[PDB]
Amino acid sequence: TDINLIEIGPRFVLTPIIIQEGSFGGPILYENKRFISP
Amino acid sequence: TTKVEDLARISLRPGPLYINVDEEKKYSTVEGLEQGYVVVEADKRFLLLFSFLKKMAKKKIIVFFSSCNSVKYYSELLQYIDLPVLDLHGKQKQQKRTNTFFEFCNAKSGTLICTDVAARGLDIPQVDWIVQFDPPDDPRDYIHRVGRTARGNNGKGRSLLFLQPCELGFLAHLKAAKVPVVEYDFPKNKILNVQSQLEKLISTNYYLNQSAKEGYRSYIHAYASHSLRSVFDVHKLDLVKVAKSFGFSTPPRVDITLGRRAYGSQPRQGGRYK
User: Fold this and answer.
1) SS3 (DSSP) at B155
2) CB contact under 8 A, B264 and A27
């Protein structure tokens, strides 16, 4: 027997903005210099 | 010093102009001295001074206070309580102050009341008594230089210091500097009690009430901002008693003063705070 997929729920897209080292602060490790804010 | 050099380096420009006006023969010898003291509680302090200033009449007395406001208040107070004095505080004309100091310098008797920092730059004449009623701003300078000017060129005058029974650690300092001390006691029955008249005067006269409040605040603040905070601590002072010394039933309101870091908190690296 094989399996097929039927979609359930959340269809959503995540544009990366920043990745920090600290818990909610600390130095910036990754910064996305492409982001165009709404 | 090195800190003064550092301050001149950060503040002044690369090219300064260095000017020297200073005497090189400073006679800060630690043996030829004798400092007398009297231990008096706060609420009687002025009374003792008043008794002293009425018993040592026909003599030369210099009295040092911590502030100009207290000098002005005690000048008006002694004008009303029929004890003649001369005043040197920084609310008068410079001409008035020079004439008053010249008149005191060429008199057979009398007493002049002033601030210790105001008479730091003053040619102190020969006087019988140098009284330090308030805590000294510069204790080393007070002891050495003011004791030398109190001893005098001729027959030896005396330098009395008023100590409360909470600033006695100063004596321990006088033990460390190897300065001989002299203790002065006073009988309780020879204090002229004018406390009720003083309180009636403060309660009925609006100008004297204002001056008393200003002198009390100035005394508290000068005591708070003291270099020797171990000997002179405002927190060990009884404000009710010292306000009674100034002539108050209740002490007026003054400000004596004037773990763990956050979870997940890393130090700030950006942003503007104004």
Assistant:
1) coil
2) no
Two tokens, residue B265 = 């908190």
Question: Tokens 């509680």 map to which residue?
Answer: B41
Give the type of residue at B232: F
**What is the DSSP annotation of A1-38?**
--------S--------EEESSSSSS-EEEE-TT----
**Amino acid (one-letter) located at B267:** P
Distance in angstroms (rounded) separating the CA atoms of residues B48 and B162: 10
Q: How far is B269 from chain A (nearest CA, A)?
A: 7
Q: Which of B114, B106, B142, B124 is nearest to B227 (CA)?
A: B142
Decide if B265 touches A, using CB distance below 8 A: yes
**Cβ proximity of B127 and B108 under 8 Å:** no
**Helix runs in B152-268, H state only:** 169-176, 195-204, 206-224, 239-246
Residues contacting B241, CB < 8 A, separation 6+: B41, B42, B43
Contact status of A9 with chain B (Cβ, < 8 Å): no
Buried b (16+ CB within 10 A) or exposed e, B5-28: eeeeeeeeeeeeeeeeeeeeeeee
CA B107 to chain centre: 24
CA B240 – CA B45 distance, rounded (Å): 13
Strand, coil or helix: B129: strand
Give the strand pairing for B181-184 and B35-39. parallel
Phi–psi pair at B110, nearest 5 degrees: 110, 165
Q: Report the distance separating Cα A1 and Cα B130, nearest Å.
A: 113
Tell the residue number behind the tokens 């909470």, with chain if given.
B166
DSSP string, B55-78: HS-SSEEEEEES-HHHHHHHHHHH
Q: Which chain B residues have a beta carbon less than 8 Å from that of A23?
A: 264-266
